[PDB]
């Protein structure tokens, strides 16, 4: 039950999309641009 949401539902999601290009989710200023998902990977080691 939102008051008047124009865009997409969420709390402290952000206005700009995730820094990454191949990412549908949105990004955040706290995650240095990246989104919740990426933000995690950023720290964790990636392979392939
Ligand atoms: Zn992302």
UniProtKB/Swiss-Prot annotation:
It comes from the Eukaryota. Changing residue 25 to A: Impairs ubiquitination activity. Loss of down-regulation of NF-kappa-B activity. Signal peptide: none annotated. A zinc finger (A20-type) spans 12-42. Zn(2+) 4 binds at residues 18, 23, 35, 38. Changing residue 26 to A: Impairs ubiquitination activity. Loss of down-regulation of NF-kappa-B activity. This is A20p37. It comes from Homo sapiens. The lineage of its organism: Eukaryota, Metazoa, Chordata, Craniata, Vertebrata. The chain holds residues 597 to 631 of 790 of the full protein.
